[PDB]
Design a protein around this nucleic acid. Structure first.
Ligand SMILES: [Mn+2]
Ligand SMILES: [Mn+2]
Ligand SMILES: [Mn+2]
Lengths: 411, 428
DNA sequence: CCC
DNA sequence: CCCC
RNA sequence: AAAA
């Protein structure tokens, strides 16, 4: 079994995991680093493949000084040496399929998830976890949260379930559109102003005063009088020390309220209601189904995934999901705005590519109507050669049944 | 008679086939474009739209033969489709450039045209811009030979309704006639004097606290008055007392009818100021100072160095590019630049916030890949410091097999010499 | 890294 | 139209 | 894994 090590390590891991039991020795062709010819090395991917495929003594590393020149290829192939030709450049594939012949040949079809011999579907045969997937793509310090280790369960203890159930009831009663509009106005008009607004008692008090310069038109009036009943019930499901409501009105802090007391009461509550809630909602709707499909939490799905390349910044991904050996990254936002949603679309498309390879699927769930979501999908669509979409946008109309929506899209 | 044929494999990246065709059309008489056919059962999309664009922008006419393949991943079906559809006419030289298509297509097409036949196989190197012949052992550099314009580049990637702006037709030269040159020169002086950081921080506070907030703030006298009422911590005093001198100069470079200052102080409308009077004075000035100016500044610091390299404006560079796929939303790119056959898209922002600049980074990465192919380069110019600039480059870096970066970020410390920095990054 |  |  |  011979493999060509390009910049996408996942196809070689899938083929290697399958065609290791039937083989003895393993050769991996990798490129060298020549900054002059703008050629980087895939040796790091070749090492990850050996480690994650357990090939300590059977593995042979063959370096090619130039993967774009047949002359320098064969010269390097001469001095040192079932071919799966799925990876590497076109030259590497030609001048190795022929050099070695001068003999079975395989190829992993990224479109139908089948290894083809010069057949066998591997979509429900070869499996991978989140740690192995990000490791072969060179990411480390992987951490995520479980259903029972969710961060906000520790912040609103003894009240989270009531809070989450109340929000879940509203969304399943098709109130998600009403919730978003109230979040835009007046919620974000009171609790989203300047930086450190909810951390300095004076900053918040000044903001509240200036808001009372419009009287009945002031957003605090919309909060007090024109707030729907299901939103009050959500607000009142929070602990009294973490409530944004003073009984049935907007809480105005006296100057005696310390900065840590204001922050300890408002900050966690505002950030959750301004969007983090939607992360938990979707994840809870998904976990109620994926377990029936034998997926294991922490191995094949989870929430708040974070990792980094070596000495490099961390990324944040709301939800990850592995179906067979395809990564499905899900980005979540309550925004109904085209600018932000588009940018969020660019982000999730690039992230799943970085951590799961070029055949990963990105899903963006927004608070936009059906027309805006179709426009965004077309705007960000990129041609990969497949009929199935690798970027999918959902909208406010999908929130109530988002669990089955994602199940149909992923599986 | 002695008919010589060139064979190209139509993958999802049309640019390499256009470059190979533009360089080899003169040497061959027939051209066979092997493309894929759509079959949803095997999740196989078709690349025929690219092969059709290749015939159009290469002017192949009837000397073009379209050879469809049913399954780009099945060795047997490819071999059968090739035998029943490759031209059996006796040729003298058969040249296959196997740069595109799937790995399976490349394997068997190369062998099929190896047994049937003079023969020569070629491959275009995306890393060092070199066409490698498999038997001539020549490696011709096409980086300075084959050229492409913005219209043909976006067209072969299936985009249309392309429009952009020129140096002389720039939008704000139409809005600030006579005064634009004075406004632009004063700003360029301060930036080339390393006053970029000061300007940015002054734009964040107190400029954006005064002229940015509610919608239609600067077009409604009542909304602007209430805003000023709400504002010794107010940004108005920071404007009237703390505003630096080079900013007073660029503010005074505006016409007195379009100036935000009322004479070393903030102009506050009286109660006889119409809504239209307010917007006519400050709207264009605020929007130009909040960021539009930076687009013109960067474009002006590069136009000279681009013309010196014999690039033609409108075809190889331009400002405010816009295009769309058929019946699809439009994109907007601040600056575009084509070096040989490589697109360089430049997104510009004066923001120093890490989150907004990160999102702007994802944007320019995706757009240049959509309109220019997978070997395009994206540049993001920000008002961030070098440490955050370098952090963003590593955060968004994607490995494709090159040593040179395909996503570059520049920061506030590059503004004074941004022309040379772009020149060295693009041309090397 | 919510918006 | 997408300046921040 | 359809200019690695
Ligand atoms: Mn494991
Ligand atoms: Mn999110
Ligand atoms: Mn811009």
């Amino acid at each position: 079994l011979v493999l060509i090590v390009g910049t996408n390590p996942l196809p070689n891991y899938v083929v290697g995991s399958h065609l290791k039991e039937k083989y003895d020795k393993f050769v991996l062709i990798y490129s060298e680093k020549n900054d002059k010819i703008n050629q980087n090395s895939t040796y790091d991917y070749a090492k990850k493949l050996k480690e994650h495929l357990n090939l300590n003594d059977k593995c042979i590393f063959l370096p090619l000084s130039d993967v774009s020149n047949s002359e320098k290829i064969i010269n390097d192939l001469r001095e040192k040496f079932h071919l799966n030709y799925t990876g590497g450049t076109k030259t590497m594939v030609v001048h190795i399929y022929n050099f070695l012949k001068e003999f079975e040949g395989s190829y992993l079809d990224a479109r139908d998830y089948k290894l083809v011999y010069d057949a066998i579907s591997l979509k429900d045969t070869i499996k991978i976890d989140i740690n192995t997937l990000l490791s072969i793509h060179l990411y480390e310090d992987i951490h995520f949260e479980f259903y029972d280790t969710y961060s906000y369960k520790q912040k609103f203890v003894d009240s989270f379930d009531k809070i989450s159930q109340e929000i879940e009831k509203a969304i399943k009663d098709d109130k998600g559109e009403d919730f978003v509009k109230w979040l835009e106005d007046p919620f974000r008009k009171i609790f989203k102003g300047e930086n450190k607004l909810l951390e300095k008692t004076a900053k918040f008090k000044k903001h509240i005063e200036k808001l009372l310069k419009d009287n009945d038109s002031s957003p605090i009036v919309k909060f007090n009088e024109k707030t729907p009943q299901f939103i009050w019930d959500i607000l009142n499901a929070f602990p009294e020390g973490k409530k944004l409501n003073d009984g049935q009105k907007l809480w105005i802090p006296d100057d005696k309220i310390t900065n840590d007391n204001l922050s300890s009461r408002v900050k966690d509550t505002v950030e959750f209601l301004n969007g983090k809630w939607f992360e938990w909602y979707v994840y809870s709707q998904i976990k109620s189904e994926l377990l029936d499909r034998k997926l294991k939490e922490g191995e094949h799905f989870g929430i708040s995934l974070k990792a980094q390349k070596k000495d490099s910044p961390y990324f944040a991904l709301d939800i990850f999901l592995i179906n067979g050996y395809q990564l499905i990254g899900i980005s979540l936002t309550t925004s109904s705005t085209r600018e932000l949603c588009k940018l969020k679309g660019f982000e999730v498309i690039h992230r799943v590519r970085q951590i799961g390879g070029d055949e990963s699927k990105a899903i963006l769930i927004t608070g936009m109507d059906k027309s805006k979501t179709e426009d965004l999908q077309k705007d960000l669509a990129y041609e990969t050669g497949s009929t199935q979409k690798r970027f999918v946008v959902f909208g406010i109309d999908d929130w109530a049944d988002i669990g089955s929506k994602i199940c149909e899209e992923v599986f």
